[PDB]
Ligand binder design. Structure first.
Ligand SMILES: CCCCCCCC/C=C\CCCCCCCC(=O)O[C@H](COC(=O)CCCCCCCCCCCCCCC)COP(=O)([O-])OCC[N+](C)(C)C
Ligand SMILES: CCCCCCCC/C=C\CCCCCCCC(=O)O[C@H](COC(=O)CCCCCCCCCCCCCCC)COP(=O)([O-])OCC[N+](C)(C)C
Ligand SMILES: CCCCCCCC/C=C\CCCCCCCC(=O)O[C@H](COC(=O)CCCCCCCCCCCCCCC)COP(=O)([O-])OCC[N+](C)(C)C
Ligand SMILES: CCCCCCCC/C=C\CCCCCCCC(=O)O[C@H](COC(=O)CCCCCCCCCCCCCCC)COP(=O)([O-])OCC[N+](C)(C)C
Ligand SMILES: CCCCCCCC/C=C\CCCCCCCC(=O)O[C@H](COC(=O)CCCCCCCCCCCCCCC)COP(=O)([O-])OCC[N+](C)(C)C
Ligand SMILES: CCCCCCCC/C=C\CCCCCCCC(=O)O[C@H](COC(=O)CCCCCCCCCCCCCCC)COP(=O)([O-])OCC[N+](C)(C)C
Ligand SMILES: CCCCCCCC/C=C\CCCCCCCC(=O)O[C@H](COC(=O)CCCCCCCCCCCCCCC)COP(=O)([O-])OCC[N+](C)(C)C
Ligand SMILES: CCCCCCCC/C=C\CCCCCCCC(=O)O[C@H](COC(=O)CCCCCCCCCCCCCCC)COP(=O)([O-])OCC[N+](C)(C)C
Ligand code: NA
Ligand code: NA
Ligand code: NA
Ligand code: NA
Ligand code: NA
Ligand code: NA
Lengths: 533, 533, 533
C-alpha cells in the first residue's frame, strides 16, 4: 500500500493549502451563479445581489477589525484624550442640548399628537421614579445606563415607528416570518393528516414551535446567532457602560428564552455579582423567544410590533435593573470571556436539526398542559365569583371585572385612553396571574372584532378598542414575567450554578417586577410616538 | 436616604404587630361581606354562612387543643386509671354486648334483606380467616386492629348507606365532583378545539386528570390536604393502635396515589419495620387517587360509591396488613415526626398550579399507552383462544369465558347472586391482569345498558345485571392492585430508601394480595347493607 | 401452628420434586389438548401439531448438545485433524469449484435474465473494491469473513427468492405480521375513538409501534428472543470467524434497534477492540428494528422483502466492517460471556408489557417531531431553490432534481435500469439527508400509483417505476444510517462505556458509511436474482 502511504503524505504535507483551495473554488462557484443571474436579468436577481454584498462587507469588516485592532485603537486615542481634557466644561453643553431637544420634541410633535401621548411621557417618568424610590441601593445609583437605555429605545422607536425606511424594513421583516411559519404545515399535514385543522392549536400551532426551535438550533450550530449577539451586546456595552456578561445575556434574550440564555455564559456564572445576576434574570423576564414568536403571529398579533418590542426590551431591562439593583462590587469577568460562547455538541447541521426538534417535545407539552390548567381554573374562579356576587345582586362579578379596576392605573399611565384602559387592564391581569399565551389569545379576539367592523358597543358593553391601544398592549405583554415561572427560573439557574442558590433566590422577585416595568417602559415610548387614528 | 432608613427601622421594630394587623383587617373584610350577604337575604347566603361557621369552629378547636393539651390530658387521666382498674372484669361485659348486637343486627336486618346479604357476611369471615391461615406470623397476631378496622368500616357503611344524613351528604359530595370536572372543558376546548369531542377519552377525559392533579397540588401548598390527613390518621391510631407512620400513609392514600403517599414520611422510611413497610404498600394497593377519580365518574361510575369505597379502604388495609404481616419488632418513629409532612418547594399558589400540571404530563402519557397496549393484547389473546377453541367445536372461547369461571367464587362470597356472579368475575379478571381503567370502562357499559331498559337476555346471553351488583363491583374494583404495577412500586420506594431494597422486594407480593382482600372486604360490607331491588 | 411448621418442612424437603411434578402435569395437559384436537379433526389441528413438534425437537436438541458436548466434540476431532492435514492441497480444489460454480451461474442464469442483472453483480464487485481501497488497514485484511458474508447473503437469496419453499415461507411470515398489526386498532379505537382514522399516522400507525414494542419486551422476558439470537450468531461465528461479541450484536440487530442492541453485551463493552466497536456501530446502521417494521408495512412496503433484507444485513455488515476496519489487536471476551445476555428486571410477563409500553413513549414522540421538522425544512429548501432557479429561467429546481443526479450512479450499479435510476436516486437522498420514514413514505406513493394502473408518463414526467426497482429500493433503504443519528449513537454508547468515548467518536463516521455500503450490497444480490417482468 505504497500509494496509500503517498496519498497520506500529500494530505499531511499541504493540508492548509488543500482545504483552502477547495473553499475558494466553492466561493467562485457561488459568485459565478450570482453574476450569471444578474446578467440574464438584474431586477429579478436583485435580492440575491444585495444579500451577497452585505455578507461580503461584514466578512471584510470583521477581518479588518480583527487584524488592525491595535492600530485603530491608538489612532482614536488622541481624540479620546482631548475629549477627557475638555469634558469638564463640555459635559454641560452636551447635556443642555439633549434636554433642549427633548423639550422641542414634546412641544412640536408630542403635544400635536394629543394628550394621550403626553401622558405616555409622564408614565415613563413615573415608572422610572418608582424604580428609584424602591431601589435596593438608592445612594449607589450609576445614572449613565439609565439615560442611555431610555435614549436607545427612543432612537429605535423614532427610526422604526417614525421613518419610512425603518417602517418598511420591519414590515418586510414581519412578512417573512409569516411566510416562514407556513412551512410547518407540510409536516403537520402528514403526522396529523388533512384534518389537522380540526384541532388548530394542537395540530397547527405547536408544529410552528417545533419548526422554529429546529431552525434556531441550526443557526446556533452555524454561528450566525452568536454573530448578531456580539454586535448588539457591544453597542450596549460601549454606550451604557454595562458589564460584558450582562450585555451578552441581554442581547441573547432577544432571540433566546430565559432558561437557555444564561448558557451563553455558563462557565462564568459562579463568579458574577449580585447586580449582574439580577440583570440576567430581569432580561429573561422582559423578553420572549423566537420559538414562540410564530405562535403569537398565528393568533393575529402584529409581527412588526413583536419584533420591535423584543429589540427595545434589551436596553430597557438593563436600565431598570441597574436602577433597581445597582452595582456595589467589582466585576471579575472580562470581555473576551463573555463574548466567547461555547457552542453545542453537534457534529453536523442535520444533527443540530434533530437536537432542536427533540428539545421542543417538553416545551410544547408544558405549553399545552399549562393552558388546560389555567383556563380550567379561570372557569372555576369565575363561577365562584358569580356565586358570591349573586349574594349582593351582582352576579356579573368576574376575574375580568376585578382586574379592569386593579390594573387600570398602569394602563392609563402608558397613555391608553380612559375607555380602553379598562380593557387593557384585563390583559395585564391575564399575563400576571397566568401567562402571555392567555393574554395574547384574548388580545387577538379584540383585534378580529375590530377588523370585522361590527358595533363597538352592544348593550353598553364595549366590544373592541382602538388600534393604538392594541399596539401599546402588544409591547406591555411581550415578556415571560408571571408569578408561576419564578420557580423554573430559580431551579434552572441553580442547576447551572449551585454555589449561588442563596443569591439567586434573593434577587428573583425583584427581577420579575423589574421585568414588568421594563415592558411597560417600551409601551410608553411606543404610545408617545404613535398617533391617534 | 434617611426616610428609607426610618421606614426600615419601623418595619423591623414592629413586624409582628404590622403583619398581624393586616390579616385582622382582611378577616374583618370577609366577615363584613358575609354578614352583609345574610342581611340582604339569608336563604340565598346560607351556604356561605355554614362554611364560615365550620371553619371558625375548627380554627378555635385546633387552637384550644394546642394550648390546653397538657391540662386536658391530666383531666382525662383519673378516668383512664379507673377503667384500667376495672378493665379486667369489664372487658367481658363490653365484648358480650358487641357480640349480642352483631347477632341482633343479623337476625333483624340482614336476614330480612335476604340470603345474598347473609352470604356477604360469610365472605367477610372467610376472607378474614384465609388471611390468618396464610399469615406470615400466625402466632404473633395482635387482634385489636383487626376488629376495630372491620368495625369502623361497618360504622361508616351504616352512617353512609343506612341513614338519610350520611346518604344525603355523600350524594351531595358526589354531585360537586361532577360539576367540578366540567371546568376542564374550557381548557380542552381551546387546545383541541370545538371538535375535542371527536376524541372523547384523549381530548376530554385526560384533561380532567390534568385539572384534578393541578388542584391537588394547590391544596397541598395551602396545607388543607395535610389538615384532613392528620384528623383521620389520629382516629385510626387511637382506636386500632396502629403505628403513627402507617396511620398517616393510610389516610393519605385516600387522596394520594401509591407512588406519592410515602413522600409524606420520606425522611423516616429507612427506619420503618417490615410490618410498617408492608402496610405502606398495602394501603397504596387498596386505594386510588383523586387525580383519576373524575375519569371514572366520566365513564358513568357512581361518584358516591367511589368516595365511600375510598374512605372505607383505609381501615380495611390496616386490618388486613396487621393480620397478614403482624409486628414482631419495636417501632422507632413517634407521633410528632410522622404527623409533620415536609411541604414542597413552591413559593406561591400559581407555582403550585404549574408544578401539578407539569407532573400530570407523564401520568396521562402512561395511562394512554398502557391502554393501547393492554387492549391490543386482549384482542390478540381472544383471537388465539378462538383459533384454539375451534379445534374442539368451541370457537366462543375467550379471556372473558375463562375468567367468568375462575373468579366466580370470589364474587359469590361478596354476596353477588349466582347469575351476576359470572359477570362480576369478568371484571375482577380485567382488573387483576390489566388495570382498573379497563375494568371500570367495562362496568360502565353494563350500567348504560341497564339504564336504557332493553332486554336483559338476547339469545340466552345476559346483557346487564342488577344495581346491587354494580355497587358491589364498584367497591371490589377500587384499588391500584394489579400484577404489572408491582415494579413501579418497588422502584419508587427503593429510590426513596435504597437501604431497604431487600425488605421492599420481600413484602411486595404479599402486599398486593392483601390489597385485593382489602377491597373485597369493603364489598362484603356494602353487600350486606344494600337491599335487593 | 404446628401444621404451618409441617407444611413448611414438606416444601423445603422436596421442593425440586414438587415443582417439577407440577410442570409435568401442565405439559401433559397441553399434550392432551393437542392429541384430542387431532383426533376430533387432524386437518383443522395441523398448525397446532406442527408447532408442538418443532418445539419438542429443539428442546430435545438443545438438551442433548448441552449434555453430550464433550463427546460430540471429540467425535469430530479425527475428521478435523484429517482435513487440516490435507488442507494444504485441498484448498485449491474447493476454491476452484466455487469459482467455477459462480461462473456457471452467471452464464446460465444471470446472463439469461438480462443486462440489469449482470450490472448488479458488477456493483457488488465495485462496492467491495471501494471498501478495500479506502480501508483503514488495507494490508491487514482477513479475507475469510468477506467471502463468507457475501456467500451467506447469496445462499439466503437463492433459498428465499429462487425456491418455492423459501418463497412460500417468507410470504406466509409476512402475512402474519400484517394480521398482527391489526390488533393495535382495538387500543387505538378507544383512546382516540372511532374517528381515529381521521388522523391516520398519529392515531393508527404510532399505536402499531407501541404494540410491537410491548410484544418485543415480552419475548425478551420469556427468553425467546435471546434463543434465536444465539442460533444465528453461532452460524456466523463458525463460518466467518468473527468475534463472539460482534457476532451477537449483529444477530441481535436483526430484531433490535441500534441504541438497544449493545445492551446485549453491556458489561464487556469497555474491553472490546476498535474493530469490534466499529462492527457494533455498523450493524446498527445496516439494520432496522421490529418496533418500526409494522409502520413501514402500513405504508405499503412489502413485508417479505423487509424481512429478507433484515436477515441478509447481518452477514453484510460484518463483511464490510471487517474490510473497512480489520482487526489488528487480540480480542479478550470469549464465547460463554458474549452469549449470556443479562435479562431485564421484570418479575412477570405483565410487568414486561408495561415496561415496553412506557419505553415507547419517547420513541413515538421523537418519530413524530423529527418528521414535522424534516418535512417543513424540505418545503422551505424547495421554495428557496425555486426562488434561485427562477433567476436562470429554471424554477423547477428542487432537492429532488439535484439528488436525481447526485445519487444516480449508486442506483445504476445496484442494477436499476437507466430510467428508474433517477427515481431511486431521489429515495437514496431522502434517506441520507433525512430518515427512512421519509424515504419509505415516498416509495409507498410510487407503489400505489403503479397498482392503480394509470399512465406511466404525464407531460414527459415518469410517475412510477417497475416492480423490480421497488424491490431493489426496499433493500437499499432498510437501515438506520443517516447523518443526524450519528450523535444519538455516540452518546448512547458512551453512556454504556464512558472510558471509550475517544474510540467511539473515531469509528462512528466510518461505521455510517459502511452501513450504507452494507445495505447496497443486499440490493445488488436481490437485483441479480430478480427477473425483469
Ligand atoms: C423623550 C423620551 C425619552 C428621551 C430620552 C433622552 C435621555 C437623555 C436625557 C437627558 C440627558 C442629560 C442627562 C444628564 C444628567 C446628569 C447625570 C450625571 O451624570 O450625574 C449624576 C446625577 O444624576 C441625577 O440625579 C440626575 C437626574 C435628573 C436629570 C434629569 C435631566 C450623578 O453622577 P453619576 O451617577 O456617577 O452618573
Ligand atoms: C432628536 C429628538 C429629541 C431628542 C432625543 C434625544 C435622544 C438622545 C439619545 C441618547 C443619548 C443619551 C445620553 C445620556 C447621557 C448620560 C450621561 C452620562 O453619564 O454618560 C456620559 C457619556 O457622555 C455623554 O454625554 C454622551 C453624549 C451622547 C450624545 C448623543 C447624541 C459620561 O459617562 P461616564 O463619565 O462614565 O459617567
Ligand atoms: C357485622 C359486620 C361487622 C361487625 C364488626 C364488629 C367487630 C366487633 C366484634 C366482636 C367484638 C368482641 C371481640 C373480642 C375478642 C377478644 C380479642 C382479644 O383481645 O383477645 C385475643 C384473642 O383473639 C382471638 O383469637 C379471638 C377471635 C375470635 C373472636 C370472635 C368474636 C388475644 O389477645 P390479643 O391478640 O393481644 O389482642
Ligand atoms: C349497632 C349494630 C350492631 C353492632 C355493631 C357493632 C360495631 C362495633 C364497631 C366498633 C367496635 C370494635 C371493638 C373491637 C374491640 C377489640 C378488642 C381489643 O383488643 O381492644 C380493646 C379496646 O377496648 C375495647 O373493648 C373497645 C370498646 C369499644 C366499644 C365501641 C362501641 C383493648 O385494647 P388492648 O388492651 O390494646 O388490646
Ligand atoms: C412482530 C412479532 C410477531 C409477529 C409474528 C406473527 C404472530 C401472529 C400470528 C398469529 C395470528 O395473528 O393469527 C391468529 C392466531 O394466533 C395464534 O394462534 C398464535 C398462538 C400463539 C388468528 O388469526 P387467523 O389465523 O386469521 O384466524
Ligand atoms: C455470485 C454472487 C456472490 C457469490 C459469492 C461467493 C463467494 C466465494 C468466492 C470465491 C471462493 C474462493 C475464494 C478464495 C480466495 C483466497 C482467499 C485467501 O484465503 O487468501 C487471501 C487472499 O485474498 C485475496 O486477496 C483474494 C482476492 C481475490 C479472489 C477472487 C476470487 C490471503 O489470506 P487471508 O487474508 O489470511 O485469508
Ligand atoms: C451454486 C450456485 C453458484 C455457486 C454459489 C457459491 C456460494 C458459496 C457460498 C459460501 C461459500 C463461501 C466460501 C468462502 C471461503 C473463504 C476462504 C477462507 O479463507 O476460509 C477457509 C474456510 O475453508 C473453506 O474453504 C470453506 C469451504 C466451504 C464450501 C461451501 C460449499 C479457511 O479459513 P481460514 O484457515 O481461517 O482462513
Ligand atoms: C424565524 C427565523 C427566520 C425567519 C426569517 C425569514 C426567513 C424566510 C424568508 C424567505 C422565504 O420564505 O421566501 C422564500 C425564499 O427563501 C429564500 O430565498 C431564502 C434563501 C436562504 C420563497 O418565498 P417567496 O419569496 O414568497 O417566493
Ligand atoms: Na428572552
Ligand atoms: Na418586552
Ligand atoms: Na391511594
Ligand atoms: Na379500595
Ligand atoms: Na437493528
Ligand atoms: Na439492511
Amino acid at each position: 500500500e505504497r500509494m496509500c502511504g503517498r496519498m497520506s503524505d500529500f494530505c499531511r504535507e499541504h493540508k492548509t493549502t488543500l482545504r483552502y483551495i477547495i473553499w475558494g473554488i466553492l466561493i467562485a462557484g457561488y459568485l459565478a451563479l450570482v453574476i450569471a443571474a444578474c446578467v440574464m436579468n438584474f431586477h429579478r436577481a436583485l435580492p440575491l445581489f444585495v444579500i451577497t454584498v452585505v455578507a461580503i462587507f461584514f466578512v471584510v469588516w470583521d477581518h479588518l477589525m480583527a487584524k488592525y485592532e491595535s492600530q485603530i485603537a491608538r489612532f482614536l486615542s488622541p481624540g479620546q484624550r482631548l475629549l477627557d481634557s475638555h469634558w469638564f466644561w463640555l459635559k454641560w453643553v452636551i447635556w443642555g442640548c439633549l434636554i433642549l431637544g427633548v423639550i422641542l420634541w414634546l412641544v412640536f410633535d408630542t403635544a400635536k399628537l394629543g394628550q394621550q401621548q403626553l401622558v405616555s411621557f409622564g408614565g415613563l417618568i413615573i415608572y422610572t421614579s418608582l424604580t428609584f424610590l424602591f431601589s435596593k441601593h438608592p445612594t449607589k445609583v450609576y445614572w449613565r445606563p439609565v439615560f442611555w437605555g431610555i435614549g436607545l429605545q427612543f432612537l429605535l422607536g423614532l427610526l422604526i415607528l417614525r421613518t419610512e425606511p425603518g417602517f418598511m424594513a420591519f414590515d418586510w421583516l414581519g412578512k417573512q416570518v409569516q411566510t416562514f411559519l407556513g412551512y410547518s404545515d407540510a409536516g403537520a399535514s402528514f403526522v396529523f393528516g388533512e384534518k389537522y385543522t380540526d384541532h388548530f392549536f394542537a395540530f397547527k400551532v405547536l408544529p410552528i414551535v417545533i419548526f422554529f426551535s429546529t431552525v434556531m438550533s441550526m443557526l446556533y450550530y452555524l454561528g450566525l446567532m452568536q454573530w448578531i449577539i456580539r454586535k448588539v451586546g457591544w453597542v450596549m456595552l460601549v454606550t451604557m457602560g454595562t458589564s460584558p456578561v450582562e450585555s451578552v445575556v441581554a442581547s441573547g434574550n432577544i432571540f433566546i428564552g430565559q432558561t437557555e440564555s444564561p448558557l451563553l455564559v455558563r462557565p462564568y456564572l459562579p463568579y458574577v455579582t449580585k447586580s449582574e445576576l439580577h440583570a440576567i434574570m430581569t432580561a429573561g423576564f422582559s423578553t420572549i423567544a423566537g420559538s414562540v414568536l410564530g405562535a403569537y403571529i398565528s393568533f393575529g398579533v402584529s409581527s412588526s410590533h413583536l419584533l420591535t418590542a423584543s429589540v427595545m426590551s434589551a436596553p430597557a431591562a438593563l436600565a431598570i435593573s441597574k436602577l433597581f439593583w445597582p452595582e456595589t462590587e467589582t466585576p471579575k469577568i472580562n470581555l473576551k470571556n463573555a463574548m466567547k460562547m461555547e457552542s453545542g455538541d453537534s457534529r453536523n447541521l442535520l444533527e443540530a436539526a434533530t437536537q432542536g426538534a427533540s428539545s421542543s417535545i417538553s416545551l410544547v407539552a408544558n405549553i399545552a398542559v399549562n393552558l388546560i390548567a389555567f383556563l380550567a381554573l379561570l372557569s372555576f374562579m369565575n363561577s365562584a365569583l358569580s356565586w358570591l356576587g349573586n349574594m349582593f345582586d351582582y352576579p356579573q362579578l368576574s376575574f375580568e371585572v376585578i382586574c379592569s379596576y386593579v390594573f387600570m392605573p398602569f394602563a392609563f399611565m402608558m397613555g391608553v385612553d380612559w375607555q380602553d384602559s379598562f380593557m387593557v387592564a384585563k390583559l395585564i391581569g391575564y399575563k400576571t396571574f397566568f401567562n402571555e399565551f392567555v393574554a395574547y389569545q384574548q388580545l387577538s379576539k379584540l383585534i378580529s372584532l375590530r377588523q370585522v367592523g361590527g358595533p363597538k358597543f352592544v348593550d353598553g358593553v364595549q366590544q373592541y378598542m382602538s388600534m393604538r391601544s392594541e399596539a401599546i398592549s402588544t409591547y406591555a405583554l411581550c415578556g415571560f414575567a408571571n408569578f408561576g415561572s419564578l420557580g423554573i427560573v430559580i431551579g434552572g439557574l441553580t442547576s447551572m450554578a449551585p454555589s449561588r442558590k442563596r443569591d439567586i433566590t434573593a434577587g428573583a422577585m425583584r427581577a420579575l417586577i423589574a421585568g414588568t416595568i421594563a415592558c411597560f417602559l417600551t409601551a410608553c415610548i411606543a404610545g408617545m410616538l404613535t398617533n391617534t387614528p
